[PDB]
């Protein structure tokens, strides 16, 4: 139990590092995205120059709808929000121990634009068409970002505690097969000893029960 | 008597290597603690960055409560407290010795 | 999909690929022991040899 439980630890560490290496690609596009938006901000940018800004902006959002509909693992989507805390569709657990309900839990909240805020309710997209909706536009991205970050600083918690049981679960392991190492496995030197002297004593009995048998010849001669 | 009471003693010396070994990760952890508290105290971190640091802290106490209950032996939990100084639930003695009491007394204090 | 290939390659040598060293240890065993067993076979093969004293 304590071999199966390290290495169902040390997938599940795998698991966790393969969803935060889509949160890195995510946390990248937004943070272009808040450049883009300070950029539009100025007041020199025309109409035009704004709608080429704003097809970027649709552009690599459509791609993080991308990786949030498409982050997956074995035949699991991982970023939909189905292993978020109010989520009813599924539950994610991990056996680290050896013994019953020896489990744990852990939670992925949503990624999709629209948890994001960078997608309306009716699927509109973030937009940077004028100035004074995109100045607010970063209003949403700082936000945004702080989502991400906070996922990712529970996902490195997760990859830490995870760490920590592998390691005592390998100790644990080591220990508890010495143990029984010590009580089922035998002592070759001490049984051969025993052998030996066993061998001696059989070897000995044999030749004296042999020379036994030729006893009672002796009463022979008085016939 | 003898030939078990060394067996009996070399088992004792397995257990007592077992808790050990288990508080061995229960140190580290709260090291770890200690370092991310050092961490935390500087003036420039914001209100959330301690959050989420937090966060962290959170999911290495909840570690340490899952060793103290999940730390087990031979049908025994060890580091629950059962076999503490003031404990009631039970005693843990080792007969090391080939004649009737020869036992010693083992303490193993909560680690909750 | 760089970053996945790594990761997803990570964890597929992590469930598949063996680890040499543990491998290596419990073949050393198992070998030892297979060296053993043939000595003390050999050995009980000639057990029964000294009941034709007796004749």
Redesign the interface.
């Known amino acids: 139990g304590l071999r199966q439980a390290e290495r169902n630890t040390?997938?599940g560490m795998?698991?966790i590092?393969?969803t935060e290496?889509?949160l890195?690609?995510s946390n990248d596009i937004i943070q272009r995205i808040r450049t883009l938006a300070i950029q539009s901000s100025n007041g020199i940018y025309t109409e035009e120059d704004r709608q080429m800004i704003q097809v970027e902006v649709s552009q690599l959002i459509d791609e993080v709808d991308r990786i949030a509909s498409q982050?997956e693992f074995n035949k699991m989507n991982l970023l939909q929000g189905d292993f978020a805390r109010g989520s009813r569709a599924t539950s994610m657990w991990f056996h680290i121990?050896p013994?019953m309900h020896?489990r744990?839990r852990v939670f992925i909240a949503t990624m999709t634009a629209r948890s994001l805020n960078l997608k309306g309710q009716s699927g509109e997209l973030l937009s940077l068409s004028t100035a004074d909706k995109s100045n607010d536009a970063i209003g949403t991205l700082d936000a945004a970002l702080?989502r991400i970050?906070?996922q990712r600083?529970?996902l490195?918690?997760?990859f830490?505690?995870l760490e920590?049981?592998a390691?005592?679960l390998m100790?644990?392991y080591?220990?508890?097969q010495?143990?029984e190492s010590?009580?089922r496995d035998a002592d070759?030197a001490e049984e051969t000893v025993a052998f030996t002297k066993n061998q001696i004593l059989?070897?000995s009995g044999?030749?004296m029960?042999?020379q036994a048998?030729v006893r009672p010849q002796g009463v022979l001669s008085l016939l």
Do not use: C, P, W
């Open positions: 040390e997938d795998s698991l590092q393969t290496g889509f890195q690609e982050a121990g013994n020896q744990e702080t970050s906070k600083a529970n490195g918690a997760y830490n505690r920590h049981a390691k005592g100790n644990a080591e220990n508890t010495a143990s010590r009580i070759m059989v070897q044999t030749a029960l042999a048998n």
